[PDB]
C-alpha cells in the first residue's frame, strides 16, 4: 500500500485522516483512581475525543446522578494518583444535567479535546431521603446494627464497608463511589469515547517545561535517526532480493529440515526470493517505517508545541494579516 522506504516521509502521503471511533473507555484505561464522586483515569496514550457517551445500568432510585462534569488534561504522568487531588491541573470540557432515572447521556463536545487523562465527576444527585435512623442489618450475621457507629455488636462487621473491596470510608459513611475501588451501589457506569488514537505532547509551562520539552524533542530525533538506519538498512537487502528475482531462476522448492515456520504448499511454491522480498519489505521495512513515521509525527507535535510556546513568550516580550491562515 505505502512506499515504506522514503526519506523525510511526506506529511501528506504518510499522515492520514485518522477517523473518530466508538472506543470503550475500559479498553484504553491503563490506570484508574477514585474519589467518592470522581473517576480519574490515565489513558494508554493521547486521544482526540469528540464525544463521550455514558450508559447507566442497575439504577437505584434512592440516589440518582443529576450532574456530570467532564474534565481532561494532556499531561504525561507515570501514575494517575499524581492528578487525583489536583483540581487546578484539570480543564473542564463539559457540564451535563440528567433527568431523574436517565440511563443514557450523550456529551457532544463543541470542539474535540486532546487528552491523555480524563476525570468524570458525579457532582450532584437527586438523592431520595429515607429513614436511616432505623437500625441497619448486619451483612454477615443479620443482627440489628445502630447507624452510629455502624459496627455490629455481635460479629464486629462494619455495615458501611464497600460490598466489593471491604474498604471503609472514614469521612463519608454513604459515598456515591468507593474511594478505593470505584464501586457504586446506586448504578453501573459504562463509558464509550467517540475518539481516535492521535498521539500528542503535554503543554509547556515555564522553562522547566520548555527545557524539558526541548530534551524530549532531541531524544525523539535521536530515536528517529536510529529507526531511519534500520529502514534504510533493509534497502540494500531489498535491492539484492530484487536482483535475485529478476534473474528469474527456476529454484525448485527446497525441503528445509526446519518446518517450524508455517509454510503452506502454495507459499513454498511461491519463489523464496519473492517470499524473502515480501517479508523484508512488507514486514520489516513496513514495521520500521511505521515506527519512524510515529516518531516523526510525535517530533512534529513537540516542535509545533515548542514553536507555539516560543511565539507566546515573544508575543508577550514584544508587547498581522487578514490571511493569517498563511501563518501558524
Amino acid at each position: 500500500d505505502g512506499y515504506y522506504l522514503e526519506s523525510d516521509p511526506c506529511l501528506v502521503c504518510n499522515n492520514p485522516e485518522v477517523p473518530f471511533c466508538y472506543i470503550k473507555l475500559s479498553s484504553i484505561k491503563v490506570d484508574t483512581r477514585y474519589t467518592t464522586t470522581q473517576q480519574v483515569v490515565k489513558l494508554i496514550g493521547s486521544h482526540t475525543i469528540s464525544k463521550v457517551t455514558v450508559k447507566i445500568g442497575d439504577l437505584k432510585r434512592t440516589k440518582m446522578v443529576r450532574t456530570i462534569n467532564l474534565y481532561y488534561n494532556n499531561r504525561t504522568v507515570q501514575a494517575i494518583v499524581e492528578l487525583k487531588n489536583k483540581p487546578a491541573r484539570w480543564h473542564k470540557a463539559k457540564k451535563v444535567q440528567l433527568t431523574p432515572g436517565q440511563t443514557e447521556v450523550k456529551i457532544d463536545l463543541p470542539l474535540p479535546i486532546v487528552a491523555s487523562n480524563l476525570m468524570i465527576e458525579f457532582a450532584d444527585f437527586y438523592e431520595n431521603y429515607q429513614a436511616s435512623t432505623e437500625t441497619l442489618q448486619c451483612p454477615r450475621c443479620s443482627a440489628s446494627v445502630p447507624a452510629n457507629p455502624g459496627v455490629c455488636g455481635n460479629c464486629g462487621e462494619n455495615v458501611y464497608q464497600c460490598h466489593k473491596c471491604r474498604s471503609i470510608n472514614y469521612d463519608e459513611k454513604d459515598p456515591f463511589l468507593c474511594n478505593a475501588c470505584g464501586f457504586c451501589k446506586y448504578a453501573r457506569f459504562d463509558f464509550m469515547l467517540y475518539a481516535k488514537p492521535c498521539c500528542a505532547v503535554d503543554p509547556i509551562e515555564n522553562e522547566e517545561d520548555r527545557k524539558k520539552a526541548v530534551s524530549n524533542i532531541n531524544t525523539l530525533l535521536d530515536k528517529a535517526d536510529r529507526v531511519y538506519h534500520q529502514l534504510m538498512g533493509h534497502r540494500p537487502q531489498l535491492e539484492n532480493l530484487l536482483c535475485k528475482v529478476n534473474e528469474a531462476a527456476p529454484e525448485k522448492p527446497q525441503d528445509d529440515s526446519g518446518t517450524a515456520g508455517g509454510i503452506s504448499s502454495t507459499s513454498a511454491s511461491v519463489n523464496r526470493y519473492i517470499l524473502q522480498l515480501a517479508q523484508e519489505y512488507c514486514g520489516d521495512c513496513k514495521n520500521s517505517f511505521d515506527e519512524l513515521s510515529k516518531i516523526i509525527q510525535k517530533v512534529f507535535a513537540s516542535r509545533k508545541e515548542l514553536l507555539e510556546y516560543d511565539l507566546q513568550q515573544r508575543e508577550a516580550a514584544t508587547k498581522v494579516q487578514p490571511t493569517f491562515t498563511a501563518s501558524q
Partner: protein
C-alpha cells in the same frame, strides 16, 4: 579524508585555498538552515550531515599547526559567524547540528 590523512596534502590543499572554500560552504549551509528555521518545520533525519562533515574537514585541516598559524585570523570571523548563527537554531536543532556547534566552539577556543 583518507587521501588527505597526511598533513603533507592537507597543507598542499590549504595553500590552494581549501580553507576559505570550506568556510564559505559551512557559512552557506548554516544560512540555509537559518533560512529553513524561519520556514516550515521540516524535520530531517540527516539534517546537518553536510554541515557536520564540512566542519569535520575544517577541524582536520586546523589540527595541523602551520595551517592554524597562517589561517587563524582568516577563520576566526567565519567560525564566529557560524557559531552565532547556529546558536539561533532552536526548532531545527538536530543532534548533528549540536555536534557541529560543539566543534565550532572547540575550533574558536583553539583559535
Amino acid at each position: 579524508q583518507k587521501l588527505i590523512t597526511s598533513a603533507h596534502w592537507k597543507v598542499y590543499l590549504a595553500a590552494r585555498g581549501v580553507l576559505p572554500y570550506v568556510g564559505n560552504l559551512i557559512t552557506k549551509e548554516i544560512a540555509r538552515l537559518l533560512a529553513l528555521e524561519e520556514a516550515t518545520l521540516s524535520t530531517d533525519l540527516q539534517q546537518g550531515y553536510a554541515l557536520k562533515s564540512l566542519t569535520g574537514l575544517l577541524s582536520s585541516f586546523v589540527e595541523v599547526e602551520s595551517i592554524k598559524r597562517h589561517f587563524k585570523s582568516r577563520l576566526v570571523g567565519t567560525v564566529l559567524n557560524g557559531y552565532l548563527c547556529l546558536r539561533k537554531l532552536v526548532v531545527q536543532r538536530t543532534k548533528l547540528i549540536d555536534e557541529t556547534q560543539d566543534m565550532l566552539l572547540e575550533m574558536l577556543e583553539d583559535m
